[PDB]
Amino acid sequence: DYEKESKRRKLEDEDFLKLKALEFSKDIVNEK
Amino acid sequence: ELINMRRYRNAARKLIHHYSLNSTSSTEYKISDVVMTMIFLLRSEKYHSLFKLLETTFDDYTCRPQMTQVQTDTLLDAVRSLLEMPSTTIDLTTVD
Amino acid sequence: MECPFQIQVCISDRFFAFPHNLVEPQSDVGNKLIENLIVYVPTDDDRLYIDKKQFPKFNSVLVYRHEHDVNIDSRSPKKTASATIVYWNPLVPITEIGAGETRVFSVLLTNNLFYCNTMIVHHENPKCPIEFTYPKSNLRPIACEIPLSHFKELVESNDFLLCFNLETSTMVKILSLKRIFCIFQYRKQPARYVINLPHEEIDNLYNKLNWERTRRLMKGDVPSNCATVNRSSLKYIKQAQSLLGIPDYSQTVVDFVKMFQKIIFPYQLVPNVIIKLNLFCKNDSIAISSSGIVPINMPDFSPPNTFDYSDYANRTNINFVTQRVLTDGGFSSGITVTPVKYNYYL
Amino acid sequence: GGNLLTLERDHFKYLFLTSYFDLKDNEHVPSEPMAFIRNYLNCTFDLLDDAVLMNYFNYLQSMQLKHLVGSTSTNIFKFVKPQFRFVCDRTTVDILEFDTRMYIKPGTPVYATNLFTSNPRKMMAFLYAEFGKVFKNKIFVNINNYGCVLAGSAGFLFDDAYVDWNGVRMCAAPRLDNNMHPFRLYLLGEDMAKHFVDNNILPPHPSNAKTRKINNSMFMLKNFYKGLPLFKSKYTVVNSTKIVTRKPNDIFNEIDKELNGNCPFIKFIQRDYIFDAQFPPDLLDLLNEYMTKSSIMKIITKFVIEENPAMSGEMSREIILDRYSVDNYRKLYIKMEITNQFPVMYDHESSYIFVSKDFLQLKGTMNAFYAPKQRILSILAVNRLFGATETIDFHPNLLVYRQSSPPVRLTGDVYVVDKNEKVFLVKHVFSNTVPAYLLIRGDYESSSDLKSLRDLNPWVQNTLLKLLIPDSVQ
């Protein structure tokens, strides 16, 4: 029935996930 | 219009600065300048008081005219507005 | 500037990194999915932050440095229906369109894209980065042209020194600044920062940022209370501080403005700090009840003719009062009297 | 059935009072037009003469109601349509605080309807259906729980009944003012206005609501409504008098005479609806018995003097000046009744002070008054000036540098302003306990540590900021 709140909460949580996923760029092994 | 108000304004400014403030400016002044200045004063209703003062002296030139305090205030305002020098002392000696 | 009708633009603060998940193939009238994907970037540096393995859908990926072209007008972009195309933070007029759709994911909204379509991904509760100056800390300088290198430091460290090579053109400087500012606004806590550039260039950059945010707002972006402060206003703030503010607070500007926010309402008048912080464009404020601020104005406008000024505007009254004060004080000059004329309505 | 209810011209003012403002009590008004008014408010038009509607609208246009639009159809009373126009000119230089509502492109037209609800989420579905009927592109689409705006220049949004579009947001410590069902539809963009003009539509009433009554618990209608708070005064008048003038000098002179005579102070009630429209005299006469809780009130007193036989022993009666019109003033006397009502006051009696001919007021401030005789520049602690018939600019000259040998010792708190130039701020209180500070300049020393400038009531600080810092830059 409502709107906004779903979108706003999803956006906020995705922003936190993005700031965490920045740190995902570390690698664990090379191949070359 | 038929009157170069700007040029007559400049001429009146120069002549009044020459006589009243007696500034360092010193150049030859011709009847053209006084005629332009008198026309400029007569044209401006604000300056009708000055115009009347100058006209009065034509017959008798030997006296200070008698006025009122409000007349003196309005005259000072008109002269100050013309000269555009609020920062100066023009109280009574200038007029005399 | 008249944007072609095949362009789709998505704008978001969190596009400083490439959004792999959102890239999808497009279909032309041939109704065949195109798997040869071609990407563009501002400078060769950004090539080092685009994984060739983050696109499982696509068969082949080719990267290029977006170098401006002159032989092709923006009114009629060149069409290469043999490969999908996706731009990233473009800084010059787009000139090449892939088959079907052509998305342009950018964090900057210049004039070249203004008249295109748009899908803004607005943001919630942005943090305001804190600007200060040293005149006691371990300053951590950051390569502005490639902020992606120092993402971990930006997340963790606190002090930061914006640093720009002299090579960078104005546009690339603007883009890097916007990247770093978005990074800050996503940070968990406010971060301190300074710029190692001449003040005039900083003012130019902030004008660019203000107009960019104006365009973003005109396309429906959620307003952000975080914004830059003019240098002249900064000098006024410094003078006020030196007059009474002893220390250097982190958000001293906000401190002043809230310290007067405490009084805006009850006395019903603008604090002069706000006035000096700002021809025309006169500012006001509100309460839930109907009343303005500057004269306690009604919600319409400055009244045209409310009441005469006969007793005041006359030269006689002003002269009398001036003479009275001069005689009482013993002055000869330096005192000016003005009638109370700025009386909209009591 | 029954003959269609009508209304004479002499009751048009009654309808105006009952509708334009928000009034609860109705005992005093006569019953005969009261029945028609009640039916009008419930929007049951079938029992109402249409000619009455047209005549009332023409009469409303006659008084030149500011920011009023309309057509020549009765539909404007029966279907949700624009009635009021505004032009928004927002400038976001505030920076300090946030407009919870959406950003609006300056220069856009604003239309206010008569639709009122309490759960806008319910209205959102139907209104979005209409908006989508108008437009075909789905770019920029901004939606929240209170409205939808496209390109910052079109759509609809919900807000309280009466709001300011000056570009003011909701800053300045938004003090509580109790409200009733406040939410009202506002239309942005000429396109939506025109679309609502030429379809004559209504919201979907609940299916159980077979009643012709359009107003529901979900949402209501109030044609040509403003919602301004209003109530019936209950003063015990003793002696009245009217004054017609515009020059404020006479107003101030009357105030000064009355203050000097007996009473310690008077209430200056300055009404808010005075500038709404060029009202006819009958309407003003009717309103003379009503007050608005949201008007502006000021308390005015003088610098009290000590023991003097010209003292009223008992505080029995107090005076009021109704600004009941643009150029009309109503003077009254009343017995002090606790049950009396007056517009609510923001703070805890920031009472104002009256300025005599002894000393002037500094420009740009409401407190800084300079005394020519003693050459003392003073800043009022909490109270603020009123009645400044003339204004004096500020120069460094006024800070006459007194020359003392040895330096003058001072008692009480002292604050340093310009240690280089020996500008000091000292607490000073008149026997009347009117706190203030004197901005003296000269040779002075305190008997205690000199407290910091940053510990003053921010009012004083703003006054100091406007005073000391040169303003040669603009």
mmCIF file of N, CA, C and O in Angstrom, chain D residues 2 13 16 43 46 66 75 91 116 124 144 198 217 222 238 263 265 288 324 345 360 363 384 418 425 456 459-460 473:
data_model
loop_
_atom_site.group_PDB
_atom_site.id
_atom_site.type_symbol
_atom_site.label_atom_id
_atom_site.label_comp_id
_atom_site.label_asym_id
_atom_site.label_seq_id
_atom_site.Cartn_x
_atom_site.Cartn_y
_atom_site.Cartn_z
ATOM 1 N N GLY D 2 -37.870 20.082 -0.276
ATOM 2 C CA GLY D 2 -37.788 21.413 0.297
ATOM 3 C C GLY D 2 -37.207 22.386 -0.701
ATOM 4 O O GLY D 2 -36.425 22.011 -1.578
ATOM 5 N N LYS D 13 -20.962 38.240 4.461
ATOM 6 C CA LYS D 13 -19.888 38.393 5.434
ATOM 7 C C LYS D 13 -19.903 37.259 6.448
ATOM 8 O O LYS D 13 -18.845 36.793 6.884
ATOM 9 N N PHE D 16 -18.299 34.343 4.793
ATOM 10 C CA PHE D 16 -16.859 34.574 4.749
ATOM 11 C C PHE D 16 -16.216 34.237 6.085
ATOM 12 O O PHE D 16 -15.220 33.510 6.141
ATOM 13 N N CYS D 43 -20.930 20.455 2.084
ATOM 14 C CA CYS D 43 -20.803 20.309 0.636
ATOM 15 C C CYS D 43 -22.039 19.671 0.003
ATOM 16 O O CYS D 43 -21.979 19.176 -1.124
ATOM 17 N N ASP D 46 -26.964 20.049 -3.360
ATOM 18 C CA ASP D 46 -28.293 19.853 -3.933
ATOM 19 C C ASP D 46 -29.370 20.647 -3.207
ATOM 20 O O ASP D 46 -30.413 20.941 -3.800
ATOM 21 N N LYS D 66 -6.272 38.705 -2.210
ATOM 22 C CA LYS D 66 -4.945 38.485 -2.770
ATOM 23 C C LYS D 66 -4.721 37.011 -3.064
ATOM 24 O O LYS D 66 -5.076 36.139 -2.265
ATOM 25 N N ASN D 75 -18.926 24.528 -10.860
ATOM 26 C CA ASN D 75 -18.084 23.352 -10.669
ATOM 27 C C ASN D 75 -16.904 23.649 -9.760
ATOM 28 O O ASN D 75 -16.429 22.761 -9.044
ATOM 29 N N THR D 91 15.289 29.910 -2.475
ATOM 30 C CA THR D 91 16.735 30.086 -2.601
ATOM 31 C C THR D 91 17.376 29.325 -1.451
ATOM 32 O O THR D 91 17.221 29.714 -0.290
ATOM 33 N N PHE D 116 -8.635 18.117 1.339
ATOM 34 C CA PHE D 116 -7.989 17.956 2.630
ATOM 35 C C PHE D 116 -8.139 16.516 3.086
ATOM 36 O O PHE D 116 -9.222 15.938 2.977
ATOM 37 N N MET D 124 -2.582 8.770 -2.514
ATOM 38 C CA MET D 124 -1.477 8.716 -3.462
ATOM 39 C C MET D 124 -1.830 7.887 -4.687
ATOM 40 O O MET D 124 -1.491 8.267 -5.811
ATOM 41 N N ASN D 144 7.468 9.945 -2.802
ATOM 42 C CA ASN D 144 7.597 9.567 -1.406
ATOM 43 C C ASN D 144 6.192 9.414 -0.836
ATOM 44 O O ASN D 144 5.209 9.345 -1.578
ATOM 45 N N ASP D 198 -10.547 20.915 -16.550
ATOM 46 C CA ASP D 198 -11.503 20.482 -17.561
ATOM 47 C C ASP D 198 -11.797 18.988 -17.490
ATOM 48 O O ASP D 198 -11.896 18.313 -18.519
ATOM 49 N N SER D 217 -14.443 10.727 6.719
ATOM 50 C CA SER D 217 -13.371 10.654 7.703
ATOM 51 C C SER D 217 -12.019 10.496 7.028
ATOM 52 O O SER D 217 -10.995 10.921 7.575
ATOM 53 N N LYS D 222 -13.232 21.873 1.816
ATOM 54 C CA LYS D 222 -13.585 23.173 2.384
ATOM 55 C C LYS D 222 -13.325 24.207 1.293
ATOM 56 O O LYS D 222 -12.184 24.641 1.111
ATOM 57 N N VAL D 238 -14.874 48.458 28.608
ATOM 58 C CA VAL D 238 -15.332 49.557 29.451
ATOM 59 C C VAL D 238 -15.442 50.823 28.615
ATOM 60 O O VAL D 238 -16.504 51.449 28.560
ATOM 61 N N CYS D 263 -0.818 53.078 33.509
ATOM 62 C CA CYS D 263 -0.570 51.646 33.503
ATOM 63 C C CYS D 263 0.914 51.336 33.340
ATOM 64 O O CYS D 263 1.685 52.169 32.858
ATOM 65 N N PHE D 265 2.135 48.925 31.351
ATOM 66 C CA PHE D 265 2.397 48.483 29.988
ATOM 67 C C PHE D 265 1.066 48.255 29.290
ATOM 68 O O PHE D 265 0.012 48.192 29.924
ATOM 69 N N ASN D 288 -14.307 42.524 14.314
ATOM 70 C CA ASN D 288 -13.857 43.253 15.496
ATOM 71 C C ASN D 288 -14.091 42.487 16.794
ATOM 72 O O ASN D 288 -13.543 42.853 17.837
ATOM 73 N N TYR D 324 -7.192 46.349 13.600
ATOM 74 C CA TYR D 324 -8.220 45.561 12.936
ATOM 75 C C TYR D 324 -8.354 45.868 11.477
ATOM 76 O O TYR D 324 -9.249 45.296 10.850
ATOM 77 N N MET D 345 2.528 33.371 22.553
ATOM 78 C CA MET D 345 3.832 34.013 22.493
ATOM 79 C C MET D 345 4.917 32.951 22.372
ATOM 80 O O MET D 345 4.880 31.935 23.073
ATOM 81 N N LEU D 360 18.722 57.790 20.630
ATOM 82 C CA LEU D 360 18.360 57.217 19.347
ATOM 83 C C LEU D 360 18.627 55.716 19.333
ATOM 84 O O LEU D 360 19.134 55.135 20.294
ATOM 85 N N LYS D 363 21.213 51.838 13.618
ATOM 86 C CA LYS D 363 20.658 51.167 12.454
ATOM 87 C C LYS D 363 21.026 49.693 12.453
ATOM 88 O O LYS D 363 22.083 49.290 12.943
ATOM 89 N N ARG D 384 14.065 44.491 23.721
ATOM 90 C CA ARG D 384 14.391 45.062 22.424
ATOM 91 C C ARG D 384 13.597 46.341 22.210
ATOM 92 O O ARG D 384 12.537 46.550 22.800
ATOM 93 N N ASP D 418 38.426 44.997 21.935
ATOM 94 C CA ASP D 418 39.599 45.351 21.139
ATOM 95 C C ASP D 418 40.687 45.755 22.127
ATOM 96 O O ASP D 418 40.830 46.939 22.448
ATOM 97 N N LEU D 425 33.559 45.726 27.189
ATOM 98 C CA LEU D 425 32.136 45.526 27.414
ATOM 99 C C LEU D 425 31.905 45.205 28.880
ATOM 100 O O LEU D 425 32.522 44.284 29.425
ATOM 101 N N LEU D 456 27.995 34.885 26.147
ATOM 102 C CA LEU D 456 26.896 35.834 26.200
ATOM 103 C C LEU D 456 25.651 35.240 25.556
ATOM 104 O O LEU D 456 25.709 34.254 24.816
ATOM 105 N N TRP D 459 21.900 36.876 21.386
ATOM 106 C CA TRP D 459 21.386 38.173 20.963
ATOM 107 C C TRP D 459 22.474 39.238 21.038
ATOM 108 O O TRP D 459 22.730 39.970 20.068
ATOM 109 N N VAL D 460 23.140 39.316 22.190
ATOM 110 C CA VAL D 460 24.235 40.259 22.363
ATOM 111 C C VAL D 460 25.332 39.995 21.345
ATOM 112 O O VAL D 460 25.933 40.927 20.800
ATOM 113 N N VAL D 473 32.608 45.785 2.761
ATOM 114 C CA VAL D 473 32.697 44.800 1.690
ATOM 115 C C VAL D 473 31.300 44.303 1.355
ATOM 116 O O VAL D 473 30.562 43.851 2.242
#
